[PDB]
Amino acid sequence: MEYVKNVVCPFCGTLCDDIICKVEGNEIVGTINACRIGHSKFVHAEGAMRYKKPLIRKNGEFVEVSYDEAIDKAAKILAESKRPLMYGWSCTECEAQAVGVELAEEAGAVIDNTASVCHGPSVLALQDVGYPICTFGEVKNRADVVVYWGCNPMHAHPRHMSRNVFARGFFRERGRSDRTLIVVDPRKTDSAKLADIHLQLDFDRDYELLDAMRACLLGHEILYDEVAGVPREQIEEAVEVLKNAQFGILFFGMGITHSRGKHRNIDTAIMMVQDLNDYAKWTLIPMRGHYNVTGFNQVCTWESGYPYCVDFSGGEPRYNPGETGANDLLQNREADAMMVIASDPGAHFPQRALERMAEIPVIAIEPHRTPTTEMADIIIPPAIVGMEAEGTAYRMEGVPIRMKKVVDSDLLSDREILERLLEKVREYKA
């Protein structure tokens, strides 16, 4: 058996890069250090469908075809389409994402990643009010106060707390004992169970709580005697905890991007972090979901100027989330075709968007059997980034780490599939 070290895990935005892979033959049979989720990706579960070849639905029955036919049929769909949606991207590597931007350009497509169902609202907020962040290493070595706001890292970023809170840092040699841990969540989550402070606020009322907290912070009196289910007195006690930090980090997640107010919940949170810096060093990090959702928003931004919801229909890049986002085009029935790559909107879009996927050509570059492949017309299986293919990924706070190739696969990588898709879309348009 072979032990491959320093492997980067291809699941969540923690992007752990200390994974040991156990390799038998040409196959990954075990892991060390990876959490329960990361391990499940690296190893094959018995009975689980791993598509060996492309597939196409001929009316009602899937048939195996070759790469050249599947890519050909997909290229024609996009070429003849007048509002194609190219969605996903977060679970592949950056060079494939770069090819996707060029392909969306060539097809006059809308290109969009899972940010539109995730921390997109944080993107909208940071575009309006700012983005005061730091890297994990400053948290580990400096953080005096650690807040998890509307995120549940024990279930969604399982090693996040061990690496950033329990870890012993340069100015924090005592690890957990040197930090006040705060969690804000209407549920007593397993993350909240470890907290020194658990603000079990009323759901959908974060914006109100943050308004009281900020008014208090700037010296004003809190109008009502209770906000978001938290009595006035503890609003003030919480603001004092933050003001007296030597170094504070606000980790936030889906509890405020998906909640009532969405991008404006992130907005008010950011500006409080900003204003806290007149009393104490303060910074925040969005708990980005997939291991490379951040990588797409980086690539798309630097190539086009915009991070997601990018519309190339006019040639020029244009950007207005709420119009040009995956769920906007699907639910308003604007999109006339959809290409999914490294994402599962069949499982993870709402009912109203799925109703539209039922009516339009759906292309799916996907290695596994999913609700999206059950709604797909063409299925194209690729080599999996981080296990069978290498490339750049971006951690939740922007740190670039290269994904490693551990074992070989006969399948093509996402990049090769997209470059062939791009060549023949040009062929049709000429």
Ligand X SMILES: Nc1nc2c(c(=O)[nH]1)N[C@H]1C(S)=C(S)[C@@H](COP(=O)(O)OP(=O)(O)OC[C@H]3O[C@@H](n4cnc5c(=O)[nH]c(N)nc54)[C@H](O)[C@@H]3O)O[C@H]1N2
In angstroms, the Cα distances linking 335 to 313, 323, 357, 360 are 12, 11, 9, 8
**What mask of x and - would describe binding to other proteins in positions 363 to 402, judged by CB under 8 A?**
-----xxxx--xx-x--------------x-x--xxxxxx
Among 7, 8, 118, 421, binds ligand H2S (CB under 6 A): 118
Among 71, 199, 353, 425, binds other proteins (CB under 8 A): 353
Q: Supply the minimum distance, in Å, between the C-beta of residue 406 and ligand SF4.
A: 14
Q: Supply the minimum distance, in Å, between the C-beta of residue 412 and ligand X.
A: 11
Q: Does 343 bind ligand X (CB under 6 A)?
A: yes
Residues 6+ apart with CB under 8 A from 396: 13, 14, 15, 285, 286, 287, 288, 294
Q: Does 289 bind W ion (CB under 5 A)?
A: yes
Instruction: Find the radius of gyration of the CA atoms of the chain.
Output: 23
- Binding-site size, W ion (CB under 5 A): 2
Let me know: does 163 contact 176? Beta carbons within 8 Å.
Answer: no
* Rounded CA separation 249/286 (Å): 10
Query: At 138, is the secondary structure helix, strand, or coil?
Result: helix
The closest alpha carbon to 366, from 391, 393, 345, belongs to 345
Q: Around Cβ 271, how many Cβ atoms within 10 Å?
A: 17
**What mask of x and - would describe binding to other proteins in positions 252 to 271, judged by CB under 8 A?**
--xx-xxxxxxxx--xx--x
Let me know: does 270 contact 125? Beta carbons within 8 Å.
Answer: yes
Task: Name which of residues 207 to 246 contact ligand X (CB under 6 A).
Answer: none
* Rounded CA separation 246/236 (Å): 18
Q: Does 90 bind ligand H2S (CB under 6 A)?
A: yes
Let me know: does 150 contact 256? Beta carbons within 8 Å.
Answer: yes
Half-sphere CA count of 250, side-chain side, radius 13 A: 26
Any idea which residue has 């914006």 for tokens?
Answer: 207
Q: Does 360 bind other proteins (CB under 8 A)?
A: yes
Among 70, 103, 111, 326, binds other proteins (CB under 8 A): 326
Which one, 20 or 215, has the nearer CB to ligand SF4? 20
Q: Supply the minimum distance, in Å, between the C-beta of residue 251 and W ion.
A: 14
The closest alpha carbon to 52, from 62, 42, 43, belongs to 62
Among 74, 85, 86, 92, binds ligand X (CB under 6 A): 92
Task: Name which of residues 266 to 305 contact K ion (CB under 5 A).
Answer: 305
Burial (CB < 10 A; 0-12, 13-18, 19+), residue 24, is exposed
Task: Name which of residues 38 to 67 contact other proteins (CB under 8 A).
Answer: 38-41, 43, 45, 47-49, 57-60
Which one, 100 or 307, has the nearer CB to Mg ion? 307
Q: Does 118 bind W ion (CB under 5 A)?
A: yes
Q: Does 114 bind ligand H2S (CB under 6 A)?
A: yes
Choose the contact partner of 159 out of ligand SF4, K ion, ligand X, none; CB within 5 to 8 A by kind.
ligand SF4
Q: Does 186 bind ligand X (CB under 6 A)?
A: yes
In angstroms, the Cα distances linking 237 to 93, 149, 241 are 44, 17, 6
Q: Supply the minimum distance, in Å, between the C-beta of residue 116 and ligand H2S.
A: 9
Residue ranges binding ligand X (CB under 6 A): 12, 37, 90-92, 114, 117-118, 149-152, 155-156, 184-187, 189, 203-204, 206, 253-256, 258-259, 287, 289-290, 341-344, 347-348, 365-368, 370, 382, 384-385, 414
